[PDB]
Amino acid sequence: SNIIAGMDLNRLDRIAEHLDRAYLHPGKLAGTMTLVARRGEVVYCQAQGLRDVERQLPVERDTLFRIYSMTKPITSIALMQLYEQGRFLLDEPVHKYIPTWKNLRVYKTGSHPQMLTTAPQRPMTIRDLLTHQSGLTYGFMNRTNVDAAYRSLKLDGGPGHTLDRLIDELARLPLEFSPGTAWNYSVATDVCGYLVQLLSGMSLDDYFSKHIFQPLGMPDTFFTVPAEKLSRFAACYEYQPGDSFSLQDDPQGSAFAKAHGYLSGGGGLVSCVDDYYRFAQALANGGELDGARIIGRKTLEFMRMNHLPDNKGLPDVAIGSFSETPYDGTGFGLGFSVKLDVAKSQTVGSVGEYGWGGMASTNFFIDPEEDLLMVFMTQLIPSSTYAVRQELRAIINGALVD
Amino acid sequence: NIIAGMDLNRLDRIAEHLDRAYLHPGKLAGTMTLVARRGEVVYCQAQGLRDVERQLPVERDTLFRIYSMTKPITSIALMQLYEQGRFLLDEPVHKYIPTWKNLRVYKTGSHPQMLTTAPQRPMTIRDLLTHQSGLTYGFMNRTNVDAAYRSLKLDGGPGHTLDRLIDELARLPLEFSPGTAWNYSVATDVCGYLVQLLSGMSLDDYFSKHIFQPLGMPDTFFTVPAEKLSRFAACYEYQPGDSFSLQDDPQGSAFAKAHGYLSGGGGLVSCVDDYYRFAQALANGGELDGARIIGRKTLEFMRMNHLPDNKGLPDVAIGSFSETPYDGTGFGLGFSVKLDVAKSQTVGSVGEYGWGGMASTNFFIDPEEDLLMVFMTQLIPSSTYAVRQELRAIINGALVD
Amino acid sequence: NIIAGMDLNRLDRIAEHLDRAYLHPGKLAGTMTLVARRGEVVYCQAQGLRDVERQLPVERDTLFRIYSMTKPITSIALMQLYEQGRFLLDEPVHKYIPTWKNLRVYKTGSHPQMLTTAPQRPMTIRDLLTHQSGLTYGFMNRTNVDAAYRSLKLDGGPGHTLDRLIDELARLPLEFSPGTAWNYSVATDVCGYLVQLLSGMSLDDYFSKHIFQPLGMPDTFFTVPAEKLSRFAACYEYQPGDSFSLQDDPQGSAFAKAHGYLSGGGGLVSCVDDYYRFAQALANGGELDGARIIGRKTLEFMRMNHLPDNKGLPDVAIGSFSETPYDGTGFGLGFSVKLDVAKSQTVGSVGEYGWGGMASTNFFIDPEEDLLMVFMTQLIPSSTYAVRQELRAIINGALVD
Amino acid sequence: SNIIAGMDLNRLDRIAEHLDRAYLHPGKLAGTMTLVARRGEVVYCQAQGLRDVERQLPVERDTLFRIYSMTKPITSIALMQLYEQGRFLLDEPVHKYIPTWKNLRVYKTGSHPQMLTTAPQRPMTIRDLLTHQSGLTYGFMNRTNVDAAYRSLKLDGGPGHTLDRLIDELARLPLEFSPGTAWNYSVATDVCGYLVQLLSGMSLDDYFSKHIFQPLGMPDTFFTVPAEKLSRFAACYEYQPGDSFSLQDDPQGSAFAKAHGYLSGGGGLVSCVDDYYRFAQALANGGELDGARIIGRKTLEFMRMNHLPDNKGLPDVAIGSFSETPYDGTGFGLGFSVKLDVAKSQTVGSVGEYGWGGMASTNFFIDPEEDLLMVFMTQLIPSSTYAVRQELRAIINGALVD
Ligand SMILES: [Cl-]
C-alpha cells in the first residue's frame, strides 16, 4: 500500500509499536529517536517518550544526545582525510609521529608503578590504532593491571585531562599485547584525534567543524553543548535491576556543557539524529552529500573492509566482551564493524553492513547492498543492556518489499 | 510446445515415469504433481487413486496429509513475529519457556532415571528453527531419549496438547548440548507453541489469519471439515515386495476430528493448489497477488545455510539425515538448502530450498531457475523411494532456454 | 580482419605452427583444425596427408579415429536416459547389472587366483561416469588387474562384445574401493552397455537415432562404410627421433569391418564437421538448429567438477592423469573441467571442458569465451606432443575483444 | 569542482604539493615526473624539480629516465608474444631451449668455484623464469654464496658482458632452491630476453623496437640513449644518510649512452613518462592502443593472474626483502605483481592491481577494477628507500569521486 524506496511504511510503523511495547511503556528506556533512510530518502523518523523524565520533557527531532563511541567513525574519517593528502601511511610506526612511544613494551607482570614488560614483536602502527589492534586499552575495561593503571591515572577523563596528557602518560605504560596480535577496544581513537591535531595543526573541534560538520550542514554536533542549546539536551540514564533506570547525567550541570579541555575523538561528541543522519548518508553515498565531500569513495571502501587478520571476526581476535556471540560473523575496519557472515551473526542483514554504537545505546548502520541506513538514539548506559539494535534490524529488514 | 523456457513434451515424461515406475507396478496409490516456472504453472497432473479401497481417483482438489511440509509454514509464522521485534534468534528459549532454563544433556540411564550433564550454553530459538536444539522425535527409535518420547506419546496421543508437549519436554534430557549437532525433532511443534505464546492466538487461527486467508488457501487445515472429507486421500504404508497397505482410512481418520493437538511440525492437510500458492509466494520473495506473508529479506535470511561453518547435514546430523542423499545440502530456518550440486549427485541449482512429508510429499523452489515443484502422494515412509530425485531429473531436463 | 571478436590473421598462426613444428619436420602426417566462437566457424584448415603411403591429402571431409572423444558422446547418450527418470547417479551399478553385486577390491595374487577385500560401498553409476569405479584398462600396463584385462582381451579381440566385457568384469577385482580414487577405465564401455540395457537399442542405433540424425552427423559411426573408405585417414604411431610409422592402414582396417564390439569408450570414426556440430550443440546448452540432444541444465551438471571436495585429477588419479599437465583440471560426467588457469600453466578459462583421443585428437569448449576447438590428427599416443596446449596458446592469443 | 573521468583534479594537485613538501624541498629526491590516467584520459602530468642538480637542469615532460626493472614487464610481454605463436609452453623445461642447463643442481655448501650441490625435485621451467621461482638470483642480493659467485663473475653487468655469457656462466652455477619451491628476485628476466632472441632470431633491441615500441609509438625507449637525446637524460642519484643523495650516474659519460654488448631484459631500458604511459595504457586496454596490438587480451589476463602456488602472496614464498610487510597481500604473475588482499596490504587500491618498479624508484600500476594507472619517475637508488609509491596511491585513490 504505502511504499517509498522499496520500503513498506506500514511495516516500519512496527518500530514505534515495538519501542512502545518493549521499552517505553514498561520503563526500560526514557525515550528514543529513530531514523531510517533508503536510496537517499528518509522513510521513517519518529521521536518517542521523554528526553528528560525528571522535567517531563519529550524527545523531539532536534533533541541532542551523547553519541559517545559513534564519535569514533567521525575521528576515523578525519584521520583518513589526511591519509588522502599523503600525510602518513597505515603501516608506518606510531612512534614516527609520537617519538616518545618508540620504546613501548608489552605487560608481563606487576602493579603500577612497578610493571615489568617484554619486547613487542614489532612497533605499533597507525593501522593498529584505527583497528584497536595496538595493545592500548580503556580504564573502564576493569580486567587487567594495565587498565587499573589507566583508572589510577584517569586516562579516560578527569580534571585537567588533555590529549597531550593522555599521550604523555601512555608513553610510560605497557601494552596488553604485541601490536597487531589481538583486538582490544581502547583509547586508540582518542590517540587518532591527537594525530589529526598533530598533522592538521588544528584542535580536533576546529578540524571536525571545518572539514566535516560545516561541509555536511551539521550545526548541532559539538564536544561542548552551547548554553543556548542546553534546553534541547537529553538526560542520560543508567540501567537498574528489574529492567529500570536512574538519572546518570542531568543535562543542566553536565560536564558536556563545560569546555573542560579534553577533546575525546573516542567518545566526546553530542549530536542529534539529523546531524548523524547527514554523516551516515554522506558515507552511504561514497563520501559526498549535496555537493560536499568529506572522504574519497575509494578511501571509504578501504575503511569498510575487514582489516582483521585472515578475514577473521571479532570473536577470533578480541580479548573482551567483543569476543561474545553477538559479534559472531562481524569484523572491523578503520573505525567501523563489518558484517562478514549473516547466518553466523544470527541477525538479518547483508554482508558489508557497517557502523558502530555508543555506550548510552546509540546505534547506526549502513547496508551498502540494500542502500539502507538507520540512526537510533536513546540514553541508557550501558549499550550491552538490551538487544534493541538487533530488534530494529529485524523490523527494518522485514519492511523491504522489493 | 514451450512455456516459461520449459518443454511441455519433456514434462509429460513425469506422468509416463510415475505410471511405469510406481503406479502400474503398485508401489504408490496415486500422485498429484505440479511444476511452475516464472509464476506460470507449466505442469499439473493427477494420476491413479486417492482411495484404492473405494476406487476413487486422485483429482486436482484431492486433500493430502503433507506432514512435515507443515514445518516451513510454522517457520514463516514464527519469522512473521521476528519481523515485528517479538524475539531474537540468539535469545534463549527459556526466556519464553522459563521451565526449560535447567534442561540438561543425556549421559546415561532409562526413563525415568536418566542422568544428565550441564549443556555448554542454553538452547536458543535459532536452535529450534534449525533442529540443532538437542530435541528429538519418538519415531527416531535410536536412543533412550526417543524411547522416553514414545513412552510419553509426545509425537501424538489421546488428550495430547502443545501445553503437554512443553510441560513433558521440561523434564527430559537433550540428545546433545544445544547447537553442537543436528537432529530432526519436535522443535517445530515448539515453534508452533511459541507462535501461540507470542501472538496470543491458537496456531490454527494464526495460520488462517496471517497465511491461508491472505494467500487464498481455503483447503489447508489441521482438521478436515466434514463437507470436504469426500476429497480426502487414504494414507498407505510400505510393504515388502514394493507394495503398500492401508495406513489411514479418510472416513474415520484422526485428521477429521478436532482433537486438541495443533502440530506445527506435521499436522496440516492441504492440496496441490494451496501448497503451490504458498511455494509461489516464497518464490516471489514472500508476496502473491498483492498479499505478503513475509519480507523478501527475512525469507532470504531463512533460505541461508544456518549450520556452523557452512557445513552440510552429513557433517552435523546424528541420524538418517547424515546419509549420502543429504550430501551437499544444508539447513536454514525450516528449509533444506542445496550447497553443492555435484556432491548431492542430483541435478539442480545452489540454493534449491524446500522440505518433504513422512508420506512422501515433496516441494522445492530453485531461486536460480525461478522453478518450483509440488509433489503429493500418500506412502509412509518418505525414505522408501527416490521419486523426488527422479522428478528433479525430469523437471531439470525440461529446461530448454 | 575480425569475426566474433577473433583476429583471423592471428588464427593463421595455427597453420604456420603445425607446418613449422609438426608437418615439415615429419612429426605428424596431417591435421584438420576447426575453431568456432559464438556459433561462427572462424578457422577451418586441412594440412598435410591423411595417408602418407598413398600420398592422399587431409581434406575437410577426411574421417578420423576419434577414440576416447567417443566418451563424451556415450556420456550424453546415458544422461539422455537420466532426463527420462530411468536411473539416478547414486544408484548402485548392481541394480542394473546384478552379477556385479559382489565385486571386491584387489589385494594380491595373479589371475586367475586374485585375493580381494570388501569395498566400503558398492559401485554407483556416478562412479562409472567419472572413472571413480575402480575399473581399469588393459593398456594401463601398471597392475595385476590390468594384466588380467590383457589376458582376457577386454579392450578388444575377435568375438568380443559388450555382453562379454560385462560377464568377464563380474569376476575381476577393482583397483580400489568405488569412489576413493580416479583411474581411466572401460567404465564408459560399461556406460554404453547401460544405454543398450535401458533403451533396448544397440549402441550404434541409439547414437544414430538420439544424437547423429538430430545433429546432422552423417559421417560418424563404429564401422566406416565401404563407399566412405577412400576418405579414411591412416593411423600413425610415434617412433624415436620425433618420427612416426604406419599403425593402421585404412584399407584393411578393423574400423571397416562390422565386428561385434561397440566401444562407447573408443569405437567411433568421425570427421571435423560432425564433431564440430556435437561440440557446438554442447556450447549452445545442448541444442543446434532446432535439434536438442540434452537439457541445458543436465549439461551444466555434467560440466561440473564431480571429484570429491572440488579436487583436481592429480589429487585423486593413480596413473599418468596425476601428472603436472592435469594440475588445476577436474572431471565431471565425461568431460575434464579447468578449475585453476594459473595452476594448469596453460591459457584458458575456468570451466573449459572437453576430452581427447589416444591418436592425439582433441576438443574443448570454453563457456566463458563461447569458444571451441576441434583438432584431428592420427598419432598414437596422445601423450607424445603438447600440440593441444600450443593450439590453446594461439587460439586464446587471437581473442581481441 | 574540476572532474575528468571521475577523478577530482583539485585532489590530484595534492601530488605536486606532497612531492614538494616531503621529497623535493627537503632534498630527498632530485626531481619527479608523475602521470595519472583513468579510462584512457591523462588526468595528471607534472614535472617537478631537477633532472640534473649539478647542471641545474629541470625535469621536463620529455626527460629520459633509467626505468630499470620496469624493463621486466616489457621483456615479459615480448616472450608471451612468442607464446601466442606456439613457440613454447610455460611448463616446458628451460633446458629444452638451453640444453647445457639440463643438469642445474641446488646449492648445498662451499665457495665458488668449489660449490657442492643436490639434485632438484624437477627441472626449471619457462613459467619459473617468468615468475622468479627458477632458483636463479642476482649479484646485488648480497645474501648467499650463490650471489657471491654472481658478483665474482660480474653476471649483473661488466665490460664485454653479453646475454650469451650470462647463459654460459649460469649453466655452471647452482640454484638457490629446487625450481618452483620458492620465489627469489633474479636474472631470470635477462634469461627471458635471451629466449626472445633465440626464438625470434632477432637481437632484443630490434625485437622490442619492431614488436612493441614502433607499434605503440614509443620513440624515446631504448637500451642506448642516442647522442641527440642525451641533453634530455636525467642524472641518477643514490641515498645518503640524513635523507640526502649523491650523484650516482652523470648522464654525460653514462654507460647508458654507449652501445656496449649487454641487452638486459631485466633492467637495461631508458624511457620517458609518455612512452611508459603508452605501454601501460595499451595493457590497461587489454593489449591494444590506437589500432596497434602488442598482446592478446586473454594472454594478458593470464599474465595478470597470481602464478604463485595455492594463490599465496610473496611473503609466503619469498626468501628476500620481498617477504617483508609491504608485499603482504600481493602475489606475482608473468612479470607483474598482483594485489590479492587490499586490507592485508594496508594500502588503498583494488584486488588485481598490477605493475612493477625500478631500482631507481620508478613505479607504475594499473588498477583494472577502476581503469586507472600511474607512471612515476625519479632517479633515487634504491627503490626500498622511501614509501612515495604508497603515498601516491593514497592521493590518487582519494581523488576517485564517482
Ligand atoms: Cl516496490
Numbering used by the authors:
A (entry chain C), D (entry chain A): 8 to 409
B (entry chain D), C (entry chain B): 9 to 409
Publication excerpt:
Family VIII esterases present similarities to class C β‐lactamases, which show nucleophilic serines located at the S‐X‐X‐K motif instead of the G‐X‐S‐X‐G or G‐D‐S‐(L) motif shown by other carboxylesterase families. Indeed, the analysis of the substrate specificity revealed its capacity to hydrolyse nitrocefin as a model chromogenic cephalosporin substrate (40.4 ± 11.4 units·g−1), and a large battery of 66 structurally different esters (up to 1730 min−1), including bis(2‐hydroxyethyl)‐terephthalate (241.7 ± 8.5 units·g−1) and the mycotoxin T‐2 (1220 ± 52 units·g−1). It also showed acyltransferase activity through the synthesis of benzyl 3‐oxobutanoate (40.4 ± 11.4 units·g−1) from benzyl alcohol and vinyl acetoacetate.
Structural analyses of free and substrate‐bound forms of this homooctamer esterase suggest that EH7 presents a more opened and exposed S1 site having no steric hindrance for the entrance of substrates to the active site, more flexible R1, R2 and R3 regions allowing for the binding of a wide spectrum of substrates into the active site, and small residues in the conserved motif Y‐X‐X containing the catalytic Tyr enabling the entrance of large substrates. These unique structural elements in combination with docking experiments allowed us to gain valuable insights into the substrate specificity of this esterase and possible others belonging to family VIII.
